[PDB]
Amino acid sequence: DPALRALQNIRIVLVETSHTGNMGSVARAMKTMGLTNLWLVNPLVKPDSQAIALAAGASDVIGNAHIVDTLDEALAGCSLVVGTSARSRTLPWPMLDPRECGLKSVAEAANTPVALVFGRERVGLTNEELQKCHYHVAIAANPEYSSLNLAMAVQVIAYEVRMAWLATQ
Amino acid sequence: DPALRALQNIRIVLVETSHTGNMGSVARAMKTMGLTNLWLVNPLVKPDAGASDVIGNAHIVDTLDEALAGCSLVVGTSARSRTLPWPMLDPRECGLKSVAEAANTPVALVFGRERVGLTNEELQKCHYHVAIAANPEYSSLNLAMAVQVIAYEVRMAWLATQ
């Protein structure tokens, strides 16, 4: 991949993933867009045969994953941290959409490591975790049905990171 | 739900889907982006979360032609081909063209089989092919993920009309 070096600095950080299959689907979503650096923070169960199975040709991304107990460890060394969250009117945070997150991530990663942080199936990220992010990224969606599956959220965000990369080419 | 009428003319057409779970995930991907209009072309088996309505209301047809009937724009997922060259779109341009055409007439966005995609004869029924730019070492997205990307670009194009 001619994107390998530009994108190897961009970490995809999954916080306390409940279903190991989702770890695998994430690894595949990542690798198809050229992202290869996966960090798992305190996963309920470590990657297993199901995670390897859903990773398909991206089982190397699972294999090479960093597994750490705390979020701080996954963020150490990163200059730019973006977490998935809807906007808040009462504890406002600076907001990105996937497209702007892609642009910003690629611009930053030319210099220094970036973390794109995703939370737990259903529950998401906690307030304590969200407060360690520089920006929150929200995916504009059907107001009737507005929550994407974990791996689908990663697939969108990774897609926009490759698109931003491609623009630099 | 303000997108519902601008996007109801966009058909998501799955050809010979072999995994009923993919059918579900596609429905979810669609619905989160406002797409509701699902067409299943000879699914291996008939359909067996919160987007169950998209599955219940699906149009189950035996031929691709039926799923394409009435459509002024048909886009199918494929890589570019050197030997069967076809006019190519990326997801972003596909989303712009789809939303523009859908204000007025039906559009079909066609996804092939797991792993192997669409036949050349199926591909020749499309006006454009859409290639999702990807890692050349590993370029094949899961069916539901391909739908998710294409549906996301469709909503982004719709949002730009607001």
From Swiss-Prot, chain B:
<dbReference type="GO" id="GO:0160206">
    <property type="term" value="F:tRNA (cytidine(32)/uridine(32)-2'-O)-methyltransferase activity"/>
</dbReference>
<keyword id="KW-0819">tRNA processing</keyword>
<keyword id="KW-0808">Transferase</keyword>
<dbReference type="GO" id="GO:0042803">
    <property type="term" value="F:protein homodimerization activity"/>
</dbReference>
<feature type="binding site">
    <location>
        <begin position="139"/>
        <end position="141"/>
    </location>
    <ligand>
        <name>S-adenosyl-L-methionine</name>
    </ligand>
</feature>
<feature type="binding site">
    <location>
        <begin position="77"/>
        <end position="79"/>
    </location>
    <ligand>
        <name>S-adenosyl-L-methionine</name>
    </ligand>
</feature>
<dbReference type="GO" id="GO:0005829">
    <property type="term" value="C:cytosol"/>
</dbReference>
<keyword id="KW-0949">S-adenosyl-L-methionine</keyword>
<protein>
    <recommendedName>
        <fullName>tRNA (cytidine/uridine-2'-O-)-methyltransferase TrmJ</fullName>
        <ecNumber>2.1.1.200</ecNumber>
    </recommendedName>
</protein>
<feature type="binding site">
    <location>
        <position position="112"/>
    </location>
    <ligand>
        <name>S-adenosyl-L-methionine</name>
    </ligand>
</feature>
<dbReference type="GO" id="GO:0002128">
    <property type="term" value="P:tRNA nucleoside ribose methylation"/>
</dbReference>
<keyword id="KW-0489">Methyltransferase</keyword>
<keyword id="KW-0963">Cytoplasm</keyword>
<dbReference type="GO" id="GO:0003723">
    <property type="term" value="F:RNA binding"/>
</dbReference>
<feature type="binding site">
    <location>
        <position position="132"/>
    </location>
    <ligand>
        <name>S-adenosyl-L-methionine</name>
    </ligand>
</feature>
<comment type="similarity">
    <text>Belongs to the class IV-like SAM-binding methyltransferase superfamily. RNA methyltransferase TrmH family.</text>
</comment>
<comment type="function">
    <text>Catalyzes the formation of 2'O-methylated cytidine (Cm32) or 2'O-methylated uridine (Um32) at position 32 in tRNA. Can also methylate adenosine or guanosine, even though these nucleosides are rare or absent at position 32 in the anticodon loop of tRNA.</text>
</comment>
<comment type="subunit">
    <text>Homodimer.</text>
</comment>
